[PDB]
Homo-oligomer: A and B are copies of this chain.
Amino acid sequence: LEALKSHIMAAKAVANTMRTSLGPNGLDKMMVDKDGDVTVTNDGATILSMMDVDHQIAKLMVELSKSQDDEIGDGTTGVVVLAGALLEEAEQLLDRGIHPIRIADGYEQAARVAIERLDKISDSVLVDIKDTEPLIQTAKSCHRQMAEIAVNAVLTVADMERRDVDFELIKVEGKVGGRLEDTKLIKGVIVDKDFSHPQMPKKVEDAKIAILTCPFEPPKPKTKHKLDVTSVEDYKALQKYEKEKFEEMIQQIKETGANLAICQWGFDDEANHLLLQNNLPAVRWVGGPEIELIAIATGGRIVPRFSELTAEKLGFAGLVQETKDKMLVIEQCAVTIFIRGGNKMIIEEAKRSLHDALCVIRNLIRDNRVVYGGGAAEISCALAVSQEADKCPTLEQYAMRAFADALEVIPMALSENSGMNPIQTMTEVRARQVKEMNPALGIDCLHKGTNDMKQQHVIETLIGKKQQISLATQMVRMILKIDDIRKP
């Protein structure tokens, strides 16, 4: 049986590692690590992205933590903290003599209760005309225009009518240099890597693009091959040969519309020369990522060849201009935002913040409902779970109450990270929720305010919490049922 307690202990370790980074006052960690740079961040989603590999059960949790929440929802730290708490209680319930399967079934019952109780606390947010602008400022002073950019980005490209699914279709590329919120919103894709030769004309109008992934030397189907190159004459004949078929690539592209092209893999030495004369010149190269962006945005049917391009495909951009990066306007349609800043730390922080923003909006587009955070929704869920537990017989009663006390960890953790007395403030808030009948208040947490939390606008959406609880109960289910730990 102690195999279960080994799993429960190793998982509680991960939880205690992560519960210090919960909330706005969370901590950062270090991570590095492949002789490379460092990353200091809250938001456990990127914390789990590294996390040295040790115990098998811990990695079961690391896989399932990203599995749904980080990939679809937002809140990741909460999943692992809640899971660890549920395990902390399942320990003292296992000691009391209850069988694990009974613990898991009880946690299922309680989970369904809390989820069914998040709908009663829910609040609605409408779409299609701003109003989500003030809903984003919560996701992070500098928020007012960032919200504008976010909504304007997601609403322009979204299924929305109807289906209620986004695309993305959207990444972000920041330039070190500028000042904070001088960031700009665009309508089309933007890439780095310039024209490959300085003498090219900037500004290519109504451009017909040529997306190709091929090398530039004509190959031969593989035979024993070798060569002879006997007389110097044949040497010059060979040079002349591929020098001819370098043009066979140039005007062949120009027959289907030229302007500028786009190449992957290699771009030869004198190729840029022969391409400069014909006003074709492309770019090299940045593969798949940033290639498929231009593929979906304009045209484009990426061509793996090598002389087989016929249009048909490609097109149709209207502007391509600039000190090292080239950016393009007027597309066939596709948005990829742009960010200013300085010191390299003013950017990449706003990228994390933005990520939070886009995620929130997408979730609202799918289902537009919100519950109020700061542990308030957790507390009320615990009230309902405990209430249903008082009316339930047999052993699942105790497992349900354990679920309640486990949910009450989020207010406690939020309190610890801000320096408040955990159980004291947590208890006071639970009391103030029973009376007042206000499932909105709890954990300031910013040390400034009236604690109402309906103010301060702290929203955790709705699918975010239902996915957090569902994933947590799913994990704890596995960990409770895992034994033997085979492995070769």
Contacts and interface: CB of A to CB of B under 8 A. Distances in A.
A51 B236 CA distance: 56
Interface stretch (A121-129, A224-232, A332-340, A356-364): A224-232
Nearest to A68: B343
Nearest to A26: B481
Contact of A221 (B52, B238, B344): B238
Interface residues of A, number: 107
A50 interface: yes
A64 interface: yes
A303 to B, nearest CB: 6
A96 interface: yes
Interface stretch (A28-36, A143-151, A375-383): A28-36
Contacts of A17: 484
Interface string A212-239: 0000011111111111111110111111
Interface stretch (A97-105, A153-161, A282-290, A436-444): A97-105
A248 B305 CA distance: 21
A296 interface: no
A321 interface: no
Contacts of A219: 239, 269-270
A64 B223 CA distance: 51
Among A60, A220, A237, A301, residue most surrounded by chain B Cβ atoms (within 10 Å): A220
B225 A486 contact: no
A323 interface: no
Interface string A284-311: 0000000000000000011111101000
Given A27-B482, A313-B199, A486-B30, A395 B226 contact: no
A158 to B, nearest CB: 20
Interface string A243-255: 1001000000000
Interface in A386-427: 393-395, 397-398, 417-419, 421-424, 427
A92 interface: yes
A272 to B, nearest CB: 7
A197 interface: yes
Nearest to A95: B88
B220 A238 contact: yes
A140 interface: no
The 4 A-B residue pairs with the shortest CB-CB distance, nearest first, are A99-B419, A224-B227, A52-B488, A221-B242
Interface of A: 17, 20, 25, 27-34, 38, 40, 50-53, 56-57, 59-60, 63-64, 67-68, 92, 96-99, 101-102, 105, 197-199, 217-232, 234-239, 241-243, 246, 268-270, 272-273, 276-277, 301-306, 308, 313, 342-345, 393-395, 397-398, 417-419, 421-424, 427-428, 431, 447, 474, 478, 481-488
14 contacts: A20-B483, A29-B482, A29-B484, A30-B56, A31-B487, A31-B488, A33-B487, A101-B419, A221-B238, A223-B235, A230-B231, A276-B305, A394-B447, A421-B421
